[PDB]
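Support case: chloride ion complex. Customer-provided input:
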Amino acid sequence: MNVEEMKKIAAKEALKFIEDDMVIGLGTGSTTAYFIKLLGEKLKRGEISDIVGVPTSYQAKLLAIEHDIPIASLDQVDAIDVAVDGADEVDPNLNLIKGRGAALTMEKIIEYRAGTFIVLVDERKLVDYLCQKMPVPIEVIPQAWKAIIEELSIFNAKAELRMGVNKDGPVITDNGNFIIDAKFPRIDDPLDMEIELNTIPGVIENGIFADIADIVIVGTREGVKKLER
Amino acid sequence: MNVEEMKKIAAKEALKFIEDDMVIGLGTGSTTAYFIKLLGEKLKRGEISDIVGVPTSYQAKLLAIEHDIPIASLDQVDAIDVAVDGADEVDPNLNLIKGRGAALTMEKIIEYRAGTFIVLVDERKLVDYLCQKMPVPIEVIPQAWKAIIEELSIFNAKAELRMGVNKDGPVITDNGNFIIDAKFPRIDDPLDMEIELNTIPGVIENGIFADIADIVIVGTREGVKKLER
Amino acid sequence: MNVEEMKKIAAKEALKFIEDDMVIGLGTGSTTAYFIKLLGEKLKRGEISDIVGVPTSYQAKLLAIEHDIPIASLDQVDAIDVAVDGADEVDPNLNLIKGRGAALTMEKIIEYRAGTFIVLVDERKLVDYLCQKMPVPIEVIPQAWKAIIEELSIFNAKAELRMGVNKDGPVITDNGNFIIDAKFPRIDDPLDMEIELNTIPGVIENGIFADIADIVIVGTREGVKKLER
Amino acid sequence: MNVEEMKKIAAKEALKFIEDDMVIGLGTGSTTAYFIKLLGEKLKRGEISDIVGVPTSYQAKLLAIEHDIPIASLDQVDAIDVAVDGADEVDPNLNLIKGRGAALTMEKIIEYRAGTFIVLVDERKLVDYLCQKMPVPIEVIPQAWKAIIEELSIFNAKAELRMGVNKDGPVITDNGNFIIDAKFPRIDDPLDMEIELNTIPGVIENGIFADIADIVIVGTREGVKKLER
Ligand SMILES: [Cl-]
Ligand SMILES: [Cl-]
Ligand SMILES: [Cl-]
Ligand SMILES: [Cl-]
Ligand SMILES: [Cl-]
Ligand SMILES: [Cl-]
Ligand SMILES: [Cl-]
Ligand SMILES: [Cl-]
Ligand SMILES: [Cl-]
Ligand SMILES: [Cl-]
Ligand code: NA
Ligand code: NA
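Agent response - structure generated as follows:
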C-alpha cells in the first residue's frame, strides 16, 4: 500500500471514533484533509448529525466550509470532545513533532483542551526518536528570529528561518509570526524540552507535542494499526 | 545573453540615479536584490555616502542588513528621494502589475511617496497590455476573500486564493492578510481599475501600479533600454 | 426618554426586520449591543429560529457568544441578509461617520454585502453635515501613519494618531493597524472623500460610510423614527 | 517629592550608565520616557556619541525618533549592551511585574539579551511580594482567551480580559493579541510561575520578569536608591 493509500486508511479509521453531537478539533495537512472530506460526505448523506468543527488553521477551516461542515471558534464552544490531526514524527512513546504546515500554535491550543487527541499518520511518520528525520518547527515573534537562532545554535541545533515559496521573504504564520526549523540531534526528553523551549523570550510555541496524543492511528503498509497509552 | 544577466545590467544602471545623502526605497525580489548588493558594495568602497534604505519587505530589509546598508521605516524619514523596485508586468504606458512576492502593500506605501520611482526589469516583464501574462495580486482581509473573488466575476477575473508551499493553507502576507490573484483577461483602464479595486471593502491594496512609475530600466538581450513617461 | 432608553427603543424596532433563517451582520458599540441582547432573547424564547450572526468585531462576537447566538465569519456564509450597526454621525442624506470603536474595517466588509443595512442611533447622532461633531477615523498600516497625517493636511484636516489608554502607545485595531482621527471642517461630498481616502496607499479603510445605509432608526425623546433614502 | 520628580531623578541616574558606542534597549512607559528624553539631549549636546536604540514598543520608537536617537530592530544588532525600562512592581529579590503598558513581549525579548538590564521606578513600584498591588499581564492568542482564564482558576487567580477605552472590545497588543490581567494572591516563586504560565498553549508571554533585572534605580522622597543583585 503506497503513501496516499496509507493516509486514506488512517482517515477512514478515525471516522469510527466520531459520533453524533460531537465538537471535533479539525487538524491540518493532507492526512487529516481526507478525514475532513469523509466527514463532510457523512454529514451530507445524513450518516452523522449535529457535528461542529473547531479548525486548527485556515486550511482546515476553508476545507470544512467547502464541505459544508459547521465551524466554530474555540471560545465559541464549551468543550472539544475529540481532536483529529496529523504529525510529522511520532516516537515510540507517542510524543510528536508537528508544525511542517506552520499551524502548530492553534493545533496545540485546540488539542490541549481535547477529551481525546487522535493522531493520523502513515508509516513513514513512525520514528525511533524525535528529530530522527524532521526539525522542530518553532513559531517566533519576528523581531526575535536571529537571536533565537543564535541561542539554539549554542544548544547544538541546526536552525534556519523558514522561507516562502509563494511569497518572497520569510514564511508568515496565520498569527503573523516567523517559523524557525530547529534540527536537534535526538530528543531524549521531549516534554521537558517542550516546556523549557517555551521559556525563551520570543518563542510563541514549539512543535514538540509530548504527553498529549491519546491514540495514534497508523496506516501501515499492510493495514491500519493503533498505538495507545 | 540570459535572464540573470539581464537583471544585473538593469540593476547596475539604476546606480546612476543614486547620490550621496539620499533616502532610498529598497524594492523586493531578485532583480532589485542585485541592486541592493551593488549599492552595498559601492557604500563599502566609499564611492557613495550617507545613504539610508527604507525596505519594502522583510526580504529587502534582511538583505540590506547583510550588506551593511543603514535602514529605517517610512515613519522615520521625511522623504523618499528615489525608490527602486521590480515588477511582474510593464505595459508601454509604464503601468505595472506587482505583487508576485506578496509585498505589494509596503511597496506601494513607499513608492507612492518617492521623488522618483525607478522600476527594474528584464525583457520578459514587458507586455503589450496589462494582464497579457500575469494576474493582479490583491491583498485582502482574510474573511473577505470569498466575497471579493465572487464580486470580481463581473470583470471575468479568474480569481484564486494564493496557497502556501512552505506552509499549509493560504499564503499570509507580512501584514497577516490573504492574497487573491485575479487573472483579468485584460484591463483597458489600469488607473480606474486600481481605484475600483481599492474601493472594495476588504481590499488592503492591489497590484496595479498606475501613474506612479517614473522610469523603467529594462535589461534586454541586446543591453539596457529605458522607458519613461 | 433618557439616552439609554433611546438606544434600546431603536434596537427593539430593528428586531421587526429579522426573520427566521436569516444571516445577520452584528454591529459594534452600545446601541447595537441592545439589539444583540434582544435578538438573543428572542432566539432563546423560540420567537425566531435558525439565525446566524456575522460579527463586525470581537466585541460583537463575544457578546453574541454570551447570548448563545450562532456565529460565523463572512467567508462561512453565502449571504448577509440584514446588517445592523450604530454610527457616530448621520447626515440628512443618511451618510455616516463610523469607527469610534475602531472596528470600521470589518463593519464595512460585512455591511457592504448586506441586503439591507440598518443603522441604529439615538437623537444625538444626527448632524447637519459630516464632521460637524466628530472626526473621520482612518485605519492605516502603521509604517504609513506619519505620511498620511501630513498628506491629509493638504485638505485642511486636523489629523491625530489615536492613542491608547489601557495600553501605552497607539491604539491597535483588531487587524494590527493604527487609527488616525481626521477632523475636517466639513465634508460636502462624503462618497468622493471616502473613495479618495481609500486610494491613498497605506489607508485600508475609512470611517465615511456613504451611500450604504438603507434605513436609519432613530431613538428620540418621544419614540422611534425610521429614516429611509 | 511627587511622583514625576521621583521618575525624573531615577532617569537622570540611569544616564550615568550609558557610554559611547552602546546599543541600548529603549523601554516603554513614562519613567523611561524621561530617560529617553535626557539621552536625546545629551546626544545633541555632543556629550555622548555612536549610540543606537532598540525600541521595546511603538511608543519608545516614536519618542526616540522625536529626540533624534538613531534606532534599529533587534535583528539589526549583534548585542544589546544595556536595556533600560520601567516596571509595575519590584519585589525585594528584584523580580518584577511588567506589562501595564501592554508591551511585555518585546520588552522581555530585548531585555533577556541585555548585558545589563536597568529598571527605573518611583517609590510606588516597590512591593513586599509580587501581586501586592498589581496583576500579572498575560499576552494571549485571541482564540484561546476564554480557555486560559478558566484554566487560571487553579491558581485562585482573579483573571480578566483587558478592555479598550479608545477602542470597543479588548485591548489589542502591538502583536495583535489580547491581554488577560491575572491577580494572583501573591507569587512566592516568581521564576517558577513565569515558566508555568508560558507552558499554557496560547500564552505568548507573561508579565513576570524574574532573574533578569541587574540594577533597580528607585526615585524616592529622600533621593535616589540603587538596588543590585
Ligand atoms: Cl502544521
Ligand atoms: Cl517579506
Ligand atoms: Cl512583491
Ligand atoms: Cl510559501
Ligand atoms: Cl492555514
Ligand atoms: Cl467602530
Ligand atoms: Cl485603549
Ligand atoms: Cl506601543
Ligand atoms: Cl508595558
Ligand atoms: Cl473589538
Ligand atoms: Na494585520
Ligand atoms: Na500576531
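The radius of gyration of chain D is 17 Å.

Case will auto-close in a few days if no follow-up is received.
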